């Protein structure tokens, strides 16, 4: 059986106390992601955190275990909590667990509720410690592996990208548009030639991007990105993050494009048209799941 080296040392110095502790790989730290649309904060993913609670040897009776918010532990961890507010206690809901007589593991749940108005961009931080309800003989919470740290990272993202893939009803153009990219810059001339079905430019990883540079500030309705027509979805654009450079020079995430219709013409539409100087597509994923997409032609709409 696998036993962690730190609690194996405790069992060596005192083999007459079964230890109850937190089961986790690596460090006791989870960075949760949330997004704000200048109205409400939303968690990216599940709002529940399930923690494994282990006991070193099967115990004679049931052990009730639970987590609690001990904010004092954040003070001795200043690397992550330097000037970051505490996650409010009222927004935590702790569900207990029971290591039933004979069992070696159980789970304890931390549920984050009503985060909507928690809009601090610095994020929030919190510390939690494992506890036992009653008094059990020759049983204790381990010295180490008894506390955990959670950071809620917050970032702005508007819900201004429509992924319906419906044809854009605007006035199309691309002669005056210029393009910049970190990969294959020499092949960007194909993005505004006459050809919609031939490929020259494509991404090779999630860190590649494609920037659309307009001649001047102008209100755009969306874009038509011609992509691959593979039946398997290889190199066919499925999803991407749409960054927009505003007139003051700040870059804002207008949302995630993530279509459900498979074809060679991707229509990325702004729910509310936006005045911008540049638009940058990032984290471009194909329908086959690989981060490599074809862009055969780019057309903007006013
Ligand atoms: Mg159970
Ligand atoms: Mg072309």
Spatial contact of 153 and 115, defined as CB atoms under 8 Å apart: no
Q: Which residues pair with 107 in a beta bridge?
A: 52
Spatial contact of 191 and 293, defined as CB atoms under 8 Å apart: no
Whether 296 has a binding-site annotation, put simply, is yes
Q: Where does the chain hold its CATH 2.60.40.1510 domain(s)? A: 1-159
Whether 165 has a binding-site annotation, put simply, is no
Q: After which residues is the chain broken (C to N over 2.5 A)?
A: none
* Distance separating alpha carbons of residues 189 and 108, to the nearest angstrom: 56
CA angle 273, 279, 281 (to 5 degrees): 115
Spelled out in words, what is the top-level CATH class assigned to the domain 160-302? mainly beta
Whose tokens are 């590649």? That residue is 208
Q: Where does the chain hold its CATH 2.60.120.260 domain(s)? A: 160-302
Extended strands (E) in the chain: 18-23, 29-36, 41-43, 48-55, 63-69, 92-95, 97-99, 105-112, 124-132, 139-141, 147-156, 161-162, 172-173, 178-181, 209-226, 237-245, 251-258, 265-286, 297-301
* Distance separating alpha carbons of residues 185 and 178, to the nearest angstrom: 11
Spatial contact of 18 and 55, defined as CB atoms under 8 Å apart: yes
Distance 192 CA to ligand 2 centre (A): 5
Distance 149 CA to ligand 2 centre (A): 50
Whose tokens are 């209100």? That residue is 219
Q: Specify whether the backbone of 146 is left (phi greater than 0), alpha (psi in -120 to 50) or beta.
A: alpha
Q: Which among 109, 116, 60 has a CA at the least distance from the CA of 88?
A: 116
* Distance separating alpha carbons of residues 213 and 61, to the nearest angstrom: 69
Token readout for 247 is 């007139």
Distance 191 CA to ligand 2 centre (A): 4
**What is the β-pairing status of strands 29-36 and 147-156?**
parallel
Which CATH number fits the domain 1-159, given the four candidates 1.10.10.10, 3.40.50.1970, 2.60.40.1510, 2.30.30.40?
Answer: 2.60.40.1510
* Distance separating alpha carbons of residues 78 and 29, to the nearest angstrom: 13
* Distance separating alpha carbons of residues 49 and 125, to the nearest angstrom: 15
Whether 195 has a binding-site annotation, put simply, is yes
At what resolution in Å was this solved? 2.9
5 CB-near residues (< 8 Å, 6+ apart): none
Distance 141 CA to ligand 1 centre (A): 18
Distance 210 CA to ligand 1 centre (A): 50
């Amino acid at each position: 059986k696998y036993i962690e080296e730190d609690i194996r040392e405790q069992l060596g110095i005192d083999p007459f106390t079964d230890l109850v502790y937190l089961g986790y790989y690596g460090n006791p730290y989870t960075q949760l992601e949330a997004i704000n649309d200048l109205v409400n904060t939303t968690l990216v993913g599940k709002n529940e955190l399930s923690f494994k609670v282990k006991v070193t040897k099967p115990y004679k009776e049931d052990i009730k275990v639970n987590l609690m918010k001990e904010d004092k532990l954040v003070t001795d961890f200043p690397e992550m909590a330097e000037g970051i507010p505490l996650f409010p206690s009222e927004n935590c809901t702790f569900e207990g667990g029971v290591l039933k007589a004979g069992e070696l593991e159980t789970t304890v749940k931390l549920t984050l509720k009503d985060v909507e108005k928690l809009n601090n961009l610095s994020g929030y931080v919190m510390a939690i410690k494992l506890t036992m309800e009653g008094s059990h003989e020759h049983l204790a919470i381990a010295r180490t592996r008894s506390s955990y740290f959670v950071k809620l990272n917050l970032s702005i993202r508007l819900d201004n990208i429509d992924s319906s893939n419906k044809k854009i009803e605007g006035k199309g153009f691309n002669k005056e548009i210029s393009f910049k990219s970190d990969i294959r810059p020499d092949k960007l001339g194909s993005l505004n030639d006459g050809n919609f079905t031939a490929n020259n430019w494509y991404t090779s990883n999630a860190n590649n991007y494609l920037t659309i540079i307009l001649p001047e500030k102008q209100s755009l309705k969306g874009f038509r990105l011609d992509t691959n027509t593979s039946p398997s979805g290889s190199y066919m654009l499925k999803s991407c993050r749409v960054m927009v450079e505003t007139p003051d020079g700040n870059w804002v995430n207008h949302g995630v494009f993530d279509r459900k219709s498979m074809d060679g013409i991707a229509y990325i539409s702004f729910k509310k048209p936006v005045e911008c100087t540049k638009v940058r597509f990032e984290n471009m994923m194909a329908f086959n799941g690989r981060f490599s997409v074809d862009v055969n032609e780019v057309t903007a709409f006013r």
